[PDB]
Amino acid sequence: VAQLTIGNSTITTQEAANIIVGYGEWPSYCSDSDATAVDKPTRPDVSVNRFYTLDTKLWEKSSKGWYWKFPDVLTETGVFGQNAQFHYLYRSGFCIHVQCNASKFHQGALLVAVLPEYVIGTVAGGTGTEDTHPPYKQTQPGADGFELQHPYVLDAGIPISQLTVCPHQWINLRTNNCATIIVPYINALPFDSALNHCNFGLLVVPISPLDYDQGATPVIPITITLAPMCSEFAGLR
Amino acid sequence: VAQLTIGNSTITTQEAANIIVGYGEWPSYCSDSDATAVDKPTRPDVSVNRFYTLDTKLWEKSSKGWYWKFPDVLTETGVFGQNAQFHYLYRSGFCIHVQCNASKFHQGALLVAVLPEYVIGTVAGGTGTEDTHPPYKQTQPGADGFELQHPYVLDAGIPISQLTVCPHQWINLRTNNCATIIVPYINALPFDSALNHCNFGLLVVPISPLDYDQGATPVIPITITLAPMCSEFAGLR
Amino acid sequence: HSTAETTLDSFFSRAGLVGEIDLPLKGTTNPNGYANWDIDITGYAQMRRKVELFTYMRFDAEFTFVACTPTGEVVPQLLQYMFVPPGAPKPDSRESLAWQTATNPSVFVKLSDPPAQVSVPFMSPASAYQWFYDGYPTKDLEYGAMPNNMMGTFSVRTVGTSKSKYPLVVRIYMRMKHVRAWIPRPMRNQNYLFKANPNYAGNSIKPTGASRTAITTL
Amino acid sequence: STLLGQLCGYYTQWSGSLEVTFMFTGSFMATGKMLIAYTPPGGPLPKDRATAMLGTHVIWDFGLQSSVTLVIPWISNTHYRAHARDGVFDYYTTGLVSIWYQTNYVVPIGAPNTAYIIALAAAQKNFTMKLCKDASDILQTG
Known part of the structure; x- marks a missing residue:
């Protein structure tokens, strides 16, 4: 166990469980010989790229499952939601x-x-x-x-029974509690709209239902913390 | 885990948690060029210096805290209480x-x-x-x-909120259970009375109250074991 | 020991039927002896689910045209097949000047002449055709609409100033070639309701496959 | 209550980085997350958890580590004030430390549904004080 920091954000997490680098690719930047080599796209490092810790959802016996959209989830949140909105294009891991x-x-x-x-x-x-x-x-x-x-x-x-075909990771209470996933920018174009198109969606569903004997806490807090990688923006407004 | 022995005393204790050597000094002896270089002060090694295990006190929700005085606590106990009493001077770690x-x-x-x-x-x-x-x-x-x-x-x-300014150690049930402290001889004189002056006092107080659900043992035994270091005596009576 | 058949290209080859034009003499159907067919590769039923296995794709299409009268007869009639690229205007009538716009490739052939056949490139201005789009184009009815997936329109008609003397039926086959696919995804297990979205019947939600009595009986 | 505090009283001015350490003393079986945020001097206490989440914060999972130490970058009692008619070299640098339940308190049957925490503070090695000023409510009685 140890705690990692990215600016003013400090999360207490386990040493280094198995991470899942989706599709074997690492969220990298985009070279100079592209579509917009003129409007040199500014890449945020300072505050823009750090640890956001979303409002914890409470697992229940009856819970059906949850999902968030990207980059939607953050276009509302902080200084990142700042860039996503008042900027024309976006690419981010x-x-x-x-x-x-x-x-x-x-x-x-x-x-x-x-x-x-x-x-x-x-x-x-x-x-x-x-x-x-x-x-x-x-x-x-x-x-x-x-x-x-x-x-x-x-x-x-679509059968969920086949969702494993996507970058996934399991969280079996009797073995682990934290799951981590690295996602590269995936889209048919180099850049795109941050408010109109949601490149992807995070899915988290109870395959084996939550259970416990009367007396144990009845809801298990699920905490999603996420951080932008090699995020770029172009055309301020 | 392992067990250490000092004569006929054998305690089962954890490997080697963090010890607190009070004021950074180790209980040492006192050289020949002192006040009483004539009455060569005899230093007990045999039985006198070993593991005494005091009557365990029972922690309760309502417990306010406990304290013992030194060397008083032992001047009653065994062969050490033997020396402390029928001897004129004393210094001990x-x-x-x-x-x-x-x-x-x-x-x-x-x-x-x-x-x-x-x-x-x-x-x-x-x-x-x-x-x-x-x-x-x-x-x-x-x-x-x-x-x-x-x-x-x-x-x-005196505020207890400031007791930490003294050689202290914490015992948080959800992390450790044993605390250890090395204390050097502290007094305005090389030697002194073992029955009239109590160089110091051991303090142990519940800062966060004991708690548990009905059904779990309601009292937590606190066991104080202590051993004299580089103890010296002078002038038999 | 060989696995050539399990490749993408192998899987998607074969020229399937994706279109059928009717050009009756007396009829409610295509009364002006002509028709416009926006290229839909879902035309081959089986197709939709196969492609919807992937998120992105890319390919070329080979089109082969089969024309005859309803009984499958051959007659001395000449035909014009016009391909109007996306962005080009389709003919509103049997005399629209679009029929003569050089920038609309056209090919002529007699019913007697064997099937007409041409290849059409990867149109899309995007780097790949994408079957799923999670957004809107700069509650709405524009959700999941990636327009840059248009291949174009195929306008068919009898040559000549006057209606044809025979009732005609054109069939369009399409072989997909040079295929590349990305990001695989769950195989549709529910019935399709619309050509646009993935909406399903929320009452008739069926289990992916055949059920049984107990988990201890076979 | 802190010793630091009491010593500041015998002085008029001071400045340095501080350091608060939190200790969870609950049952070993409990787990959860607490968000601890610092709002520099001037910045008003964050409306909610999320807005505090954007400030200099620390997510604390007492399920993993029973202790955590926060550093206060800087505090400076230098800005003079002559209010009533009694001049007091006051703060204004009232930096703020908020603490929110990131997640709820989770526990298995058999463990108490409440636990306490202890705050411990001290100043960094860059601390300093100026102007001896003897002041006290406690004095030697007649």
Whole structure:
């Protein structure tokens, strides 16, 4: 055990569990011979790139699962949400860290994976004849996130049973509590909009339900801490 | 874990937690060019210097704190109490060891410090107009020790909040259970009386109260084991 | 010992049927002896789910045209197939000047002449066609709309100033070639409802596969 | 209560970096996270956890480490004040230290649902004081 720091942010975390570098690539920058070599894109290092610790969600027996969108989650938050908004283009890598705090008397298993272009699909009326498009509160939940309503198909008509095909990591209470994931910038373009397009979405679902005997804390706090890697911006407004 | 022995005394203790050598000095002897170079002071090694294990005190939720005086505590006990009494002068260093035995389901924090010339001050009547001097049972409690009645001011008009300024060590149940302290001879003179003057007093107070859920043992045994270091005596009677 | 068949190209080869134009004489259907077909590769039913296995893709398409009368007959009639690239204007009528705009590749062939066949490049202004887009283009109805995935339109019509003398049926096949794919994703396990979004039936949510009685019986 | 405090009283001015250490004394089975944030002099106490989350902060998981020490970069009692008619060389540098429940207190059956914490402070080696000023409420009685 030891604590790492990035500016004014200091998190207490375990030595170095197995990290998952999504798709074997490290969030790097973008060279000079690109599309916009004129408007030299300024890369934040100071405060912009540090440890943000989102409002902890409480695991319950009945919990269905949660998901956040990127970069949406932060475009609201602090000095990073500052850049994302008053800037024309954005490319950024991510270090995501998820941890639970539970006694050796709780049981559960959370799959934690990242899914590019996570496009939500609602119920469509029920009988299948209403072309209802997911709201804005469902498409970009912010930093509070949003709860799945049909985990089995990941609110989008896809088996979750196959989500492992994405950069994932498991959190089995009886073995580990913290899971870490490095995500590179993934998109069909070098740069893009930070407010219109959500390159990906963080998914965390209880595959084995939370359980405990009466008397033990009934809710397990899940704490998501995340940090931007090699983040770049272009065209101030 | 391992067990150390000094003669016929064998204590089972943890490998080697952090020890506190009070004031950075080691209990040493006193050279030949002193006050009494004639009456060559005999230094006990055999039985006199070993492990004494005092009557364990029981920690409770309501416990206020305890304190013993030195060398008083031992002048009653065994072959050391033998020398202290039938001898004119005394100088001795001390190794003090304090341990609790509690399940990972108890909580508490005991500050354990040593205070030179610990002079007790009673209440003084209450309203402040009675010049009542602390009894003999309060000034030299023996090996059973004595309980504070006004821990906050350490039964002497001094903030305990500042006791850390003395050779101290903490015992937080959720981290350690044993605390150790090496004390050198401290006095304005080379030698002194073993029955009239108490060079110092061992203090152990619950700063964070003992706590547990109904069903767990309600009292945590605190065991004080101590051993004399480079103890000397002069002028037999 | 060989695994050539499990490659992407192997998986996506084969020219499948993705389009069918009807040019009846008397009819409600395409009354002006012409038709416009915006290129949809979902035209081959089986397709959608196969491609939706990946997030991004890239490829070239080989188009082969099969034309005959409803009974599959061959007749002396000449035809014009016009490809209007994305951004180019499709013909609103059987005499729109678009039919003559050089910048709209066109190919002519007699029904007798064997199938027409041409290759079309990776259009998209983006680095890859992307089946999923989690955003909107600078609650909405523009969600999941990556327009830069348009391949173009195919306008078909009988040559000549006058309607054709025969009822015609054109079939469009498409072989995908030189394929590259990225970011694989969960195989659609629910039925598709719309060509645009992944919405499903929230009542009729079925288990991925066949169920059984007990977990101890086979 | 701190000794530092009492010594500052016999002096008029001072400055240096401070250092507070927190000690969790709860049951060993408990875990959770506390956010400890420092708002430099002038900055008003952060509205909520999230806004404090943007300031110089430290996430403390007493599930991992039972202790944590925070450093106060700087404090300077140098700005003079002549209020009533009694001149007092006061702070203004009232730096602030807030502490929020990042997560809730989690415990298994059998462990107390409350625990305490102890604050310990001292000043760095860069501390200093100026102007001996004897002042006290406690004096030798007649």
